[model samples]
Target: VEKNNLKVTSPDSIKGIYECAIGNFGVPQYGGTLVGTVVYPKSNQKACKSYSDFDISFKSKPGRLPTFVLIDRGDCYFTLKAWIAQQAGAAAILVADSKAEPLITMDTPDYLQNITIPSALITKTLGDSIKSALSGGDMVNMKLDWTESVPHP
Candidate 1:
C-alpha cells in the first residue's frame, strides 16, 4: 500500500524557468524544471563571476536579491561556476551550451552533491535570445514548478 512514486510534471502544465518567453522551448531535467527569477552577472562579462580559487566572481545577484544565474560554457567547469554562484547567493545555475545535447545529466557526484540549488542546461540559440532580450534592457524573470519525485537506489 505504501509505494514510492516519482511524479513528473509536464512542461506546459508547469509555470517555471524551463521556458521563458510565451513560446519558450521545453528542456528535460532530473525530474522537472526548478523555477527561479532570472538573473545575470553584475558585469555581464565572460569569466567575470568565478569566485573560487579560479575565475572571476560576478557577485551575481539582482535588486540586492538572490536568483538563478545564466552562464555560458567555456573557460570553466559548469560545477565550479555553480559553486561560485552559490557563494554569491544564487538560487540556481543555468548553463547554456548549445554544442552539448539536451537533458544531459550532470552525473551527480558527492562533492558537487552538496550544491543545494537546482540547475539545468539550455541551448546556445536560447541563450542568445536571453542575451538579446537582456541587451535590449528587458528583464527576464523565469520560474519553474515541480511535481516530480526522483527515487534514488
Candidate 2:
C-alpha cells in the first residue's frame, strides 16, 4: 500500500487518525509499527540545511519515547533531510507538504545506504494542524502503524 495511518494521541482536539504517504528512501517498518513523540525543530523547520549549523539535535533523552522529527518539505532532496534527521537520532521523519496536495512518494536520486529510519509525507493541512497544536503547548504523541501495509504471515 502507498498510504498508512498516522494516529495522534494527545490533547483531545487533534486526536484522530490521518493518512500519510510512506517515503521510498528508508527502511520502512512494513509489518511493524512505530510510536513516538513528535518534535518540530525550533529553527530550520526545513531540514534542507545542516542541522549542526543550528546547534540542535533530535536525540531524545533517556526514558523518553523515540522522536519523529517533523520537517517542512521543500528546498532540498528528501534523502538529505532523512539523512540529517537520522544523524541527529530521529527514529523517523515527517515531511509536511508546503501546499495542499495529495500525498506523494518521497524518493531518492540514488541508492542511499546510510538512511535507516523511516519517513512519511503528510498533507499541508495535517502538518499545520499538528504544528499549531505544538505551538499551543501541547505534546503530540503519534503512531505510525504499518501492520496492514505488508503481510505478516
For residue 18, model 1's alpha carbon misses the true position, in angstroms, by 4.7
TM-score, cand. 1: 0.60
User: Runs in model 1 with CA error above 4 Å?
Assistant: 1-35, 42-49, 52-66, 98-103, 108-110, 149-151
Q: Which candidate is the best by TM-score?
A: 2
Residue 115, model 2, lDDT? 80
State the lDDT of candidate 1 residue by residue for 58-103, as single tens digits. Answer: 3444554335677766665556655666676666666676463544
Model 2 scores worst on lDDT over the 10 consecutive residues at 107-116
Question: Mind giving the per-residue lDDT tens digits that candidate 2 earns over 32-91?
Answer: 889999989988888877788888888889999889999999898998899889877889
Give the distance in Å from residue 133's predicted Cα in candidate 2 to where it truly belongs: 0.4
Residue 103 alpha-carbon offset, candidate 2, angstroms? 0.9
The TM-scores, one per candidate, come to 0.60, 0.93
- Each model's lDDT comes to 0.49, 0.87
